[PDB]
Design a protein around this ligand. Sequence first.
Ligand SMILES: O=P(O)(O)OC[C@H]1O[C@H](O)[C@@H](O)[C@@H](O)[C@@H]1O
Ligand SMILES: O=P(O)(O)OC[C@H]1O[C@H](O)[C@@H](O)[C@@H](O)[C@@H]1O
Ligand SMILES: CC(=O)N[C@@H]1[C@@H](O)[C@H](O)[C@@H](CO)O[C@@H]1O
Ligand SMILES: CC(=O)N[C@@H]1[C@@H](O)[C@H](O)[C@@H](CO)O[C@@H]1O
Lengths: 263, 263
Amino acid sequence: LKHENWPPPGPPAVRTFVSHFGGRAVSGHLTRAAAPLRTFSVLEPGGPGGCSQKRRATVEETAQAAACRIAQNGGFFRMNTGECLGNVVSDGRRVSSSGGLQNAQFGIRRDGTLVTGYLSEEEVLDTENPFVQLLSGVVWLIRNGSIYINESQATESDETQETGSFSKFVNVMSARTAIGHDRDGQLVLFHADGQTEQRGINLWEMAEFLLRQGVVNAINLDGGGSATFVLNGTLASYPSDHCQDNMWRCPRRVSTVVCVHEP
Amino acid sequence: LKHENWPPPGPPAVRTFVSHFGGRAVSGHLTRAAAPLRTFSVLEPGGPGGCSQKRRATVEETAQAAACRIAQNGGFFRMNTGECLGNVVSDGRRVSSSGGLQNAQFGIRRDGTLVTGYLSEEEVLDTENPFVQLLSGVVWLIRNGSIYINESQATESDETQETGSFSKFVNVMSARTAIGHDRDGQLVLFHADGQTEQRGINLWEMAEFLLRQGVVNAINLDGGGSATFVLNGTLASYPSDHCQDNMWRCPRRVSTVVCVHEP
Ligand SMILES: O=P(O)(O)OC[C@H]1O[C@H](O)[C@@H](O)[C@@H](O)[C@@H]1O
Ligand SMILES: O=P(O)(O)OC[C@H]1O[C@H](O)[C@@H](O)[C@@H](O)[C@@H]1O
Ligand SMILES: CC(=O)N[C@@H]1[C@@H](O)[C@H](O)[C@@H](CO)O[C@@H]1O
Ligand SMILES: CC(=O)N[C@@H]1[C@@H](O)[C@H](O)[C@@H](CO)O[C@@H]1O
């Protein structure tokens, strides 16, 4: 009712793009990975226990301990405290709660079922077919093959992102990332390089792009300076944050990470 | 007095930028590596013997065989035949000739002397202090701390690059790459993502950027679709060529490669 369940039924395919959104050229990658139950992980910052310690680490640091073939930044977090925000299940271990808020979620149950959308506390704690991986974003981009941004603005909590108003967060140009799946049950990761209010895409544009790629459900993960794409442990994107006291670009220390590893 | 000699004076510094050239945001990397006599190699495509066999291989393929920490596409080539163009010396092995043409060159001799500029056949074939690495480009960007593109346009042969007229090659927007060195004798590698006549920079813009980073000599290497940046064997740039029959971007099979590796 409030979420989509996809029953469960080959190295990941990493695609590089430079595409035009509203006339602007935006670079990024689309990753497609089969057998998510075997290859998909949600990782805590700096290894197990990171969310409890409120640790912040770069996607590179977190991914290299896990030997991820493809890693991207994960959920939203409080920059000043390192608190993980939203429900998180990391390799069977629940390490973050929604705190009453309703936000877009994506995860996989123990039998391989992919779940996307708004989950109650009871659904998250279900011991029957428990979640093995789960994280929260902000805005349910695609529901059952249709854009669901209008509905997200109407119903989703707006206490997690710090970009500004919900409308600005939805419509501003920025770096963006998203997670979802296609109709064959393959995991889909997306990222686009950008910089808030300067370069990149908004959520309407990302949702259209993903529908073209066959995505049937997907949520928006952390963007802006948090957006990071790490390929075999190497940074392969252009972060927007500047390094300290110079104008070079530097990857942000973030919280949870989404990982695709070998089965 | 047609070339410059720089006497021999930590891991390499890899920096990411997104920088603005006339209001266009251009992304790329600047690499700086010490002790080039021990850490810098020019590689033949695929493996040793690539030039004699007219091999074309991606920078990734060529670099994974050499264990490069940083790799970029090298000199110019003929796409239809795979012929290596210009003088090439790869770890002491001479594998390509100038054919009488005059083009910007960059090399290091056995004692560590860094050499940039125009070289006679006698200088290339010298055996007293022989070249251990050497490759040729098109346009001498910076000579002893001053831009030298006007002089290069005045003197360099124009039979190697296939972009079009000399003026277009210099002034057109595109993906670009460059090799040079700073006054501490360190190797500098530069690349900017782009697409000929759509995105990127021209040679004047790249030359101005390199001067601000302390580059005292540099030449222009193969740009356009050839431009590739590979870090620890993983592609970390956005090539402009499309893959066969789809919207995704694919690295180009190129010729010689410039490599920074362990000493
Ligand atoms: O991640 P974004 O969208 O680029 O925002 C990053 C910026 O947000 C606000 O301006 C501040 O909190 C700054 O710390 C930061 O420069
Ligand atoms: O490396 P570049 O600059 O992108 O050039 C690639 C292009 O060169 C030529 O002009 C044409 O044959 C094009 O069809 C080709 O795609
Ligand atoms: C465009 C975008 O998503 N920016 C996000 C912001 O919303 C979020 O509050 C913060 C920490 O999670 O990271 C980034 O700044
Ligand atoms: C703008 C630019 O660098 N273009 C080059 C072209 O000049 C060269 O002829 C070809 C093969 O080396 O590769 C790229 O297309």
